[PDB]
Symmetry: C4
């Protein structure tokens, strides 16, 4: 469960990294950071797409990616972080 | 279920596209992108309303639109993406 | 239920409007718009607090306000928007 | 329950305060404010990391912190705010 969502999240972030590095000219690290900041809905806006291709991709990436990323966050919190916290209390 | 939320999401995004293109002077593609970035709560701020009409509309659009857009995202994730993922594992 | 959350949301937004208009010098309409953009987690950043008082208030306002605003949005979506949609289908 | 999430949220925010004050050169109050604005997903972008260290930390901080912060917000809303509201109605 967690492993599948972890792998899917990595793949989704790799896709954004490649897209934004190529089409929007970002350094790969900036493209990865931007992809994370986007799909977690933080949205600083220090980076944002300038091209119409980038804007269209971003629309679709948000709709397809938010569900996966927040599914991963939920499983991380409930199946990894929560048991680790409980274990520390004993 | 999914079809109804899909159609409602398209209609909601068309409404924002028309509003922001007219009142805020955005290109239609920018107005659509801004509407998506708003209702998914990303909020880059590369675009934001400059007129009081735009600010008032945005308040109401957020309150009326977030529930529909995140209902659609939830149904997309659970009723489309999840079964597709499970099918790939077999 | 819905009425109580509606009133609480209005009161919470009035509080932010008064605070940001006074301490951060915003026009009341801008303060209301900023309060909404904050508590719905959109966060354009076209407005943001410049004073330390404003930053401290914003921290506490977010933590106390997000739960109320998203409780209201949930009740709006499920108890008002959903039945209205279903009624249109018949 | 609430106490544990409260303490964990404080610890998580202290960690961000120390990190962003040191690596990104922010005043401690700005680092705390930025940490809150990040983990609640508001993301104004008035502050954002400029260094690659800061961007990498921010990616990991978001993934590890969102679950804790929104767990705390949920418990605050349902176990503290809700009973206080109900008590006011009698
Ligand atoms: K945001
Ligand atoms: K958000
Ligand atoms: K934002
Ligand atoms: K922003």
């Amino acid at each position: 469960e967690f492993q599948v969502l972890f792998v899917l999240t990595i793949l989704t972030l790799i896709s954004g990294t490649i897209f934004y590095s190529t089409v929007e000219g970002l350094r790969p690290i900036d493209a990865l950071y931007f992809s994370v900041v986007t799909l977690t809905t933080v949205g600083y806006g220090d980076f944002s797409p300038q091209t119409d291709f980038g804007k269209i991709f971003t629309i679709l990436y948000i709709f397809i990616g938010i569900g996966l990323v927040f599914g991963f966050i939920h499983k991380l919190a409930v199946n990894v972080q929560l048991p680790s916290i409980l274990s520390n209390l004993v």
